[PDB]
């Protein structure tokens, strides 16, 4: 029953400091190497550090992308591993995952002393977010059902969700009755630093103007409750 | 200084397949490799280390080959739990710089589908808010891959859209697309056609759709 649960993250400006905590179960914590991955909206994996067991004197190692900013330290006594960072960017934004990690040793004789490494137990991450966004509820804008956006015998028709911060928002479209058909896309991050997606459903082109279609969109962090009706 | 390139960037299987990807890495690296799996959602999974080292608990249909600059795993008799993207890792260094590939996604193979497109103008209330987004929507449609290339008055356009995609339908195995053009009312006002043009596998010839202003 090895488990990992990092906490900490949220939101936080440029040019600030923040502190993620992870703590360890169901392992001898202090007998191991530990350590932190990431992974940046949209791209792949990246390693931020590790830290050696007390016994053998703790040295922390860095990513080229974070070293200078970031110190890894340890809490044996409460078998928590801290990331402690500073000067923090925008393209520092990423899901953290605490790593519990081995080094096997490597068996052929020119190499004793050598070791494999890796990341052998995950957690399931904590977000951080780094913006100087100030919260903002949506603008909703109906994107209307017309020629130019008919295929065959099927109409397209949608709501764009834009200039909001920060995530996320919730789409519906008709309280929750109508489901088939439905695609709310994943939000994407404008070069203004507000975020921005489009719900759309497809229907019979015979639907319109004796159907109505109305998208709920809910912005918690703003209160914000937008009901559009989308017309042709 | 090790870079790590993985091939192909995405995979089509069904359950029962064998499945290749490579790893070729920008320097000879003995058996120095890790494998991870990881789907959306769940914390990845280390797989394989020393390049062939099975990790205990791990199916033995996850094979790793490979010692120098080229990598394999080898997913065999592929199952449903199997659909994810796989990240070889190097773990040469004694100062450590743990470079991860790129990532391969491995998705659920169905049969080619086309996508329905579709094109929205902006609307009149957002061209008030100083504002102008185009939507070019690609519906249902498999594989994953699809160019989506913007023209406006016949000239084309960079830097100024984004795509936003589904994850793969739980159901049907399709994806839907977005790609999004924004310009200010004052570019929108100015010119006069706007077009998205679509390729996909499912295609034999681009679909292009279009508007023009008014």
């Known amino acids: 029953e090895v488990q990992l649960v990092e906490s900490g993250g949220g939101l936080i400006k440029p040019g600030q400091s923040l502190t993620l905590f992870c703590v360890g179960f169901?392992?001898?914590?202090?007998?191991?190497?530990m350590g932190w991955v990431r992974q940046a909206p949209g791209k792949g994996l990246e390693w931020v550090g590790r830290i050696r067991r007390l016994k053998d004197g703790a040295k922390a190692e860095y990513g080229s992308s974070v070293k200078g900013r970031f110190t890894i330290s340890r809490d044996d006594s409460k078998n928590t591993l801290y990331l402690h960072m500073s000067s923090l960017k925008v393209e520092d934004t990423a899901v953290y995952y605490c790593?519990?990690?081995?080094?096997?040793?490597?068996?052929?004789?020119?190499?004793?002393?050598?070791?494999?490494?890796?990341?052998?137990?995950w957690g399931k991450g904590t977000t951080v977010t780094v913006s100087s966004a100030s919260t903002k509820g949506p603008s909703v804008f109906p994107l209307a059902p017309s020629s130019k956006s008919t295929s065959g015998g099927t109409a397209a028709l949608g709501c764009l969700v834009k200039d909001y911060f920060p995530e996320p928002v919730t789409v519906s479209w008709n309280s929750g009755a109508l489901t088939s058909g439905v695609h709310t896309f994943p939000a994407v991050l404008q070069s203004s630093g507000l975020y921005s997606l489009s719900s759309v459903v497809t229907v019979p082109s015979s639907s319109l103007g004796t159907q109505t279609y109305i998208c709920n969109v809910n912005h918690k962090p703003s209160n914000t409750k937008v009901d559009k009706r989308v017309e042709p | 200084d090790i870079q790590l390139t993985q091939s192909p960037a995405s995979l089509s299987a069904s359950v029962g397949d064998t499945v290749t990807i490579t790893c070729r890495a920008s320097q000879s690296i003995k058996d120095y490799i890790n494998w991870y799996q990881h789907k959306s959602g769940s914390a990845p999974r280390l797989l394989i280390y020393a390049a062939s080292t099975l990790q205990s608990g791990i199916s033995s249909r996850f094979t790793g080959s490979g010692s120098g600059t080229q990598f394999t795993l080898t997913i065999n008799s592929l199952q449903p739990e199997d659909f994810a993207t796989y990240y070889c890792?190097?773990?040469?260094?004694?100062?450590?710089?743990?470079?991860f590939g790129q990532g391969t996604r491995v998705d659920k193979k169905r049969t080619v589908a086309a996508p329905s497109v579709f094109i929205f103008p902006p609307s009149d209330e957002q061209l008030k808010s100083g504002t102008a987004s185009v939507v070019c929507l690609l519906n249902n449609f498999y594989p994953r891959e699809a160019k989506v290339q913007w023209k406006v008055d016949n000239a084309l356009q960079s830097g100024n859209s984004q795509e936003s995609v589904t994850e793969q339908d739980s159901k049907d195995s399709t994806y839907s697309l977005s790609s999004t053009l924004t310009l200010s009312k004052a570019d929108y006002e100015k010119h006069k056609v706007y077009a998205c043009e679509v390729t996909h596998q499912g295609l034999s010839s681009p679909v292009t759709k279009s508007f023009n202003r008014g």
């Open positions: 890792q190097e773990a040469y260094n004694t100062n450590p710089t743990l470079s």
């Open positions: 790593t519990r990690d081995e080094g096997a040793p490597v068996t052929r004789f020119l190499e004793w002393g050598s070791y494999y490494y890796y990341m052998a137990v």
């Open positions: 169901g392992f001898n914590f202090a007998n191991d190497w």
